[PDB]
């Protein structure tokens, strides 16, 4: 393909002054030695390609980002709907993949996978028609609904999606909605110009919330649900690569960690894996 | 209208498909793109950059900087192995946490030649020579300079130039090797033995230090994307 890898031109014996093996890293330069410089090699036509490791093919796979549950019963109206400030730090599998790059600019596909489970107790439902969920997106500053059966579920401007159960998972696309020119994954700075407030990327995260509710009162019985959101970035560009994270995450608004070792442990410095008897090489 | 027939595989949700989708907010005006320096067009542009290799990660060394330093002394020697480790850039205690292994563990297959750069961090007056051998997986790992000098080996002299890139070639019977290797796709061993020894003038430090580097050559390739067995969690992070 267009990502084809370089071929090895053949090479015979040599006796020269141009030593390609000897270099000097103090210049901060990774050597470009192909195996043809330290031994005799043969002309092979290498047909391997690097398509599977481009950025778009490396990131264009949906991964879970949130897991919220909610009821349709009565009382404690904080349980009839679910809230989520849009973050990409609560599920680790995707956070670590994003934290290899400093800046990111992309579009996005969002697919919602909702599963509903009936709840125990007396006065069960016997038969219940299909359920219907509403998923309203509230930009930063919109009127937040306080419970189900509230005025703000009109969504006269907010993008809202209605999904009856028993239908293909819902999906819509969102363009690059950042304020700046790239989603800053890291922000070494403060919020107030007096160097106080909230330190970290927690201040750049202004994307709004996502609210979900049942449009069905039911009356006869309780039925919980489980909302699962999936992010799939496409048309993606990345800048300023980073070293991958080592210590496990602890908080969803910080980079905090605990000091962990650099790798696992071997038995000795010169331990090839097998069990060795004592001697003047391995001891 | 037009008569259709729903094929198997409808109403399903594949995570790695390429479908169009209606946009939530139409006619959105996106902010312009500016030329931020350092665009990454492919992940091998990251995997081709050197990174230090903790080859001294034995017992209580992983909780210090000592994991990165190889101790060398200037005694008789000639009978001592400086270091030996398998060639397993995906599953090995040596360089699974380097820059190369972290990108590798995101995949299942790999291929191509891997470089190894050795830097001498001794005094300015200390000389010496070393034999950096690589053995293909045909027999047991070498144990004296005799049995190691046969395989692919380079001889390294320290001078004004303080680096020698032992370039481990790609010798295998499969076009790709598994990341989490086994007996079948084993790759071999990499050792390093004294050839003359450290000689220092009076007043110089008798012991020196070598660091190891690792990167992928310009024929490296990768396939079969997967999730990394390196990061985990229990519940949501709040």
């Amino acid at each position, epitope marked *: 393909a267009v990502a084809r890898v370089a071929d090895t031109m053949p090479t015979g014996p040599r006796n020269t002054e141009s030593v390609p093996a000897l270099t000097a890293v103090e210049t901060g330069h990774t050597s470009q030695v192909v195996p043809g410089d330290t031994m005799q090699t043969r002309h092979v036509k290498n047909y391997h390609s690097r398509t599977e490791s481009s950025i778009e093919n490396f990131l264009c796979r949906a991964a879970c980002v949130y897991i919220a549950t909610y009821k349709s019963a009565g009382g404690t109206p904080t349980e009839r709907y679910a809230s989520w400030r849009i973050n990409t730090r609560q599920m680790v599998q995707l956070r670590r993949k994003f934290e290899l790059f400093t800046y990111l600019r992309f579009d996005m596909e969002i697919t919602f996978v909702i599963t509903s489970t009936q709840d125990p107790g007396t006065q069960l439902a016997q038969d219940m028609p299909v359920l219907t969920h509403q998923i309203m997106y509230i930009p930063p500053g919109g009127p937040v609904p306080n419970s189900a059966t509230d005025f703000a579920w009109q969504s006269s401007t907010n993008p809202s999606i209605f999904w009856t159960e028993g239908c293909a998972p819902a999906r819509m696309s969102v363009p690059f909605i950042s304020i700046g020119n790239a989603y800053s994954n890291f922000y070494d700075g403060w919020s107030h110009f007096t160097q106080e407030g909230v330190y970290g990327f927690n201040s750049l995260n202004n994307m709004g919330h996502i609210y979900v509710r049942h449009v069905n009162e039911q009356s006869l019985g309780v039925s919980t649900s489980t909302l699962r959101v999936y992010f799939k970035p496409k048309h993606v560009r990345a800048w300023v690569p980073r070293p991958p994270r080592l210590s496990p995450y602890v908080k969803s608004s910080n980079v905090n960690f605990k000091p962990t070792a650099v790798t696992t442990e071997r038995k000795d410095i010169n331990d090839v894996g097998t069990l060795r008897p004592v001697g003047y090489t391995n001891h | 209208g037009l008569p259709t027939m729903l094929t198997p595989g409808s109403n399903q949700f594949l995570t790695s498909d390429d479908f169009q989708s209606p946009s939530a907010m139409p006619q959105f005006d996106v902010t312009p793109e500016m030329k931020i320096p350092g665009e990454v067009h492919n992940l091998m542009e990251i995997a081709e950059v050197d990174s230090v290799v903790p080859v001294n990660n034995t017992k209580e060394n992983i909780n210090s900087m000592e994991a990165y330093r190889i101790p060398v002394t200037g005694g008789d020697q000639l009978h001592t192995q400086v270091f030996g480790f398998q060639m397993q850039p995906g599953l090995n205690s040596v360089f699974k946490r380097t820059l190369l292994g972290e990108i590798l563990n995101y995949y299942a297959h790999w291929s191509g030649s891997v470089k190894l750069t050795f830097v001498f961090c001794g005094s300015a007056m200390a000389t010496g020579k070393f034999l950096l051998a690589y053995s293909p997986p045909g027999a*047991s790992p070498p144990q004296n300079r005799k049995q190691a000098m046969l395989g692919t080996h380079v001889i390294w002299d320290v001078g004004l130039q303080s680096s020698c890139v032992l370039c481990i070639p790609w010798i295998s019977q499969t076009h790709y090797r598994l990341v989490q290797q086994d007996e079948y796709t084993s790759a071999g061993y990499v050792t390093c033995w004294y050839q003359t020894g450290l000689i220092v003038p009076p007043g110089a430090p008798p012991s020196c230090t070598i660091l190891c580097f690792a990167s992928a050559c310009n024929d490296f390739s990768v396939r079969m994307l997967r999730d990394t067995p390196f990061i985990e969690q229990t519940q949501l992070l709040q």
Partner: antibody
Amino acid sequence: LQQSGAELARPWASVKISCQAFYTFNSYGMQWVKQRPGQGLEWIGTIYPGNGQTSYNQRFKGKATLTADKSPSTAYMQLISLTSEDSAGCFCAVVPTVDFDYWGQGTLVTVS
Amino acid sequence: DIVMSQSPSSLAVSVWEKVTMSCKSSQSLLYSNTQKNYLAWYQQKPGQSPKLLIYWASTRESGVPDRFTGSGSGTDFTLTISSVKAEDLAVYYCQQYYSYPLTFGAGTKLELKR
């Protein structure tokens, strides 16, 4: 190989045992073995000379401390907090990673 | 820890009787670099310091007869005593070169029967 014939020690105290021979230090470590009539031979530890390494058996870690300097041609082993269980014949041996070879005579340590 | 078993722990035998004695290891004292078992055989004469009998589990020492011969491989060994004489009544200890704690075997006491 020369080792002193016997040592008389008071319990809850230390003993320093010496070993000395024509052999020099190339790749040969110094082995120390504790021999008691009721039981078999028990290894205490060794001290190789090429890397100047010191090794002790878990059982004897904290009980046996052994030191050797190049000039005396003598290897030493010290034991502390002696009890009747330490009364035994202690042998020093050589090892060129080829065999345990020979030991020689020993100190009949008596804790009395 | 690698332990060394000895069986029988002791046996009394008369003159001119071929005796053996097994020393079985809890781990195969044979490495695949040179294929040389790491086992040592030792004779401690009654009230005497021990001496070498068989090193590399295969080779004899000087001043030692063919009634002392190493034999075996892997994790099980024995020392064939072909024609016993009046200098074999003693205790014999096997030993391993492989694991750092150099534990000796139980100790066979070849007894003399008159």
